[PDB]
Amino acid sequence: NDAVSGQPSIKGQPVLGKDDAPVTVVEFGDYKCPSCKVFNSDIFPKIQKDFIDKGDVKFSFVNVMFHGKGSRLAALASEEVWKEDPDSFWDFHEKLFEKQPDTEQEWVTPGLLGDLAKSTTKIKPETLKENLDKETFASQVEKDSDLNQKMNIQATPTIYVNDKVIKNFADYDEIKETIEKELKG
């Protein structure tokens, strides 16, 4: 009972990289996932430099709800940024992972998310914060949830390289080699 092999649809999802990048890397992640915090700092910048910058890979992120209410809030704020300020999306995304503490208990508040919006985006904190309260972008969260279930996501982050499921997100060798194999044929 693992993640299913197959190309996940990135239709309607946040993307970074050239439109015609031949390889799509998809992260199924969670803003409260400590491994996703590690992927963001340790692995993602290498994917950027080695592949995204040169147009080989486009990267996408799909929300997964494994850590309770804080995961939902963070997902909702994330969905709004992509919709309302796409060009700023990745600065907000990375700064949220960087704001994740190394402690267990809840930390995701509307106030924190609004403050990240303020510093990284065109979006007004009170606009976020109003939308979070009303759960305006719930449908985008449920869209991702449907996709997580279709792909049978068991743990975060789960990385896809085209139709290939990466066994270890923190093994950059596996990730680089799989991107390069996909790039060949």
- Binding residues for Ca ion, rule: CB under 5 A, are 13, 144
Rank residues 11 and 134 by Cβ distance to Ca ion and give the closer one.
Answer: 11
- Rounded to a whole number of angstroms, the minimum distance from the CB of residue 141 to Ca ion is 8
* Euclidean distance between CA atoms 7 and 162, whole angstroms: 5
C-alpha–C-alpha distance, residues 117 and 95, integer Å: 10
Nearer to Ca ion, 66 or 172 (CB): 66
Locus of tokens 């950027």: 48
Name the residue whose CB lies closest to Ca ion: 144
Residue 57 and residue 21: Cα distance in Å, rounded?
5
Measured between alpha carbons, how far is 185 from 57 in angstroms, rounded to an integer? 14
- Tell me how far, at minimum, the Cβ of 105 lies from Ca ion, in Å: 26
Interatomic CA distance for residues 109 and 113, integer angstroms = 6
Q: Which is nearer to Ca ion, 84 or 144 (CB)?
A: 144
**Least distance from Ca ion to the Cβ atom of residue 174, Å:** 25
CB of 103 to Ca ion, least distance (A): 27
